Structure 1
């Protein structure tokens, strides 16, 4: 059912596994994410960015998710606003039916980040909605400790080396796991990893075989993601991996049949590739069989 984000992440926090947070922008992404969760018996964190919400309309974003939840009522589902940029954006997500909201104010000084986050928290918590915030651009663990105590935010995303998109590491992957463990120790709350796509080898091969160009993009290796969960990460933001796998198959259908224009012929194999990415990620993070 559609539940508070913290309902899912407190269990993951206490038992020591990661729940993937998967972005979607339309029905095909959402269906494949849900079939993955049903097939791996895994909780689901479903994420929509502000841009995704503008593309779908927030009424359709929430509406499609609610339909999917009633289709799979046995799966714990949180619907999460990814990188909300204003109080008003977060307030609109709360009013529309989101069960989790992120307020990203990490580009501000500590005092202004805490101020705005706290404002979001008391609004969201009044409405039964959980809150994510971000600290770092890396994190100061003692800032994190104070930030969490005073804001009462439900989960925290500390900067430990990742970044959005595919072009993460200009060389070898590097995450500061000592800093992670200290944050986790001092805050004792669920933590979140942004920019956590791995770009597996098969997904990249699929994309390049379809004539795509990834441009030397490298994600977080699987072994770093597992070490992250061992360090205390409980929500693993994942988007790029899904897009590459999906568009790989769309490119492939276009290439191999120039007369094909049935949309289902493009998006059925795209859905399948995306679902498989999600299933494997669920097993990697340790959320499989957790229902």
Structure 2
């Protein structure tokens, strides 16, 4: 059922596994994510950016998820506001029915980040909603310790070297695992890895074969994702991988049959490829068979 974010991540934290947090912007993405969770017996973090919420309407974003939760009532699901930029946005998400909100004030200085995070936390906890914040313009583990203690935030995204999107590394993949472990030891709460898409080889091949361009793309190696979870990561934000796999199949259908305009013929295969990315990621991170 639809549950407070901390309910899923505290179990992940206690048992040391990672739960993918999968973005969606419409029905097809949402359905494939849920079918993956059903097929791998995995709890689900479903998240929506402010852009996705604008695109869908917050009423549709929450409404579709509630329909899917009723369709799969045995699956623990948290609905999470990804990269909330203001108190008011986090408050709107709470009022609408989100069960987790992220407030991203990591571009502010420490005191202003902590001040706004603490304000979001009070509002959210008053409503039974868990809260994520972010530290790292890389994270300072002693700042993280104080930040978590004073804010009462439920989970923290410490910056250890990732970034959003398909172009994460110009050199060798490198994540500061010693820093992650220090943060984990000093905070002892669930941690979040942003920018955690891997761009798997088969997703890349699918995309390029359909005529796409992924020049210079590099994701987090699978081994780095697994080492992140060993280091204490429990929420693993994933979006780019889903988009590439989905749009690869759309491009393919368009290439292979110029007369095709049944939307289902484009989006059924796209859903299948996205679903398969999620199922593999659930296994990799350790959330498979955790229901």
TM-score interval, normalised by the smaller of the two chains: over 0.9
CA shift, 1:137, in A, is: 2.1
Instruction: Give 5+ residue unaligned stretches, structure 2.
Output: none
Q: Secondary structure at the match of 1:101?
A: strand
CA shift, 1:216, in A, is: 1.1
CA shift, 1:92, in A, is: 0.2
CA shift, 1:81, in A, is: 0.1
Instruction: Give 5+ residue unaligned stretches, structure 1.
Output: none
**CA deviations over 1:211-237 (Å, ceiling 9, x no partner):** 000121100000000000000000000
Q: Equivalents in 2 of 1:215, 1:101: separation in Å?
A: 34
Residue 48 (structure 2) pairs with residue 44 (structure 1): no
Q: Equivalents in 2 of 1:172, 1:214: separation in Å?
A: 18
Q: Equivalents in 2 of 1:168, 1:57: separation in Å?
A: 30
Q: Secondary structure at the match of 1:124?
A: helix
**CA deviations over 1:241-279 (Å, ceiling 9, x no partner):** 000000000000000000000000000000000000000
Q: Equivalents in 2 of 1:106, 1:3: separation in Å?
A: 26
Please give the TM-score of this superposition, normalised by the length of structure 2.
1.00
**CA deviations over 1:16-74 (Å, ceiling 9, x no partner):** 00000000000000000000000000000000000000000000000000000000000
Corresponding pairs, count: 291
Q: Equivalents in 1 of 2:214, 2:70: separation in Å?
A: 37
**CA deviations over 1:90-146 (Å, ceiling 9, x no partner):** 000000000000000000000000000000000000000000000012000000000
The list of structure 1 runs, each at least 4 consecutive aligned residues, that deviate by more than 2 angstroms after superposition, is none
RMSD across aligned positions (CA): 0.3
Q: Secondary structure at the match of 2:183?
A: helix
Q: Equivalents in 2 of 1:241, 1:142: separation in Å?
A: 33
CA shift, 1:171, in A, is: 1.8
Please give the TM-score of this superposition, normalised by the length of structure 1.
1.00
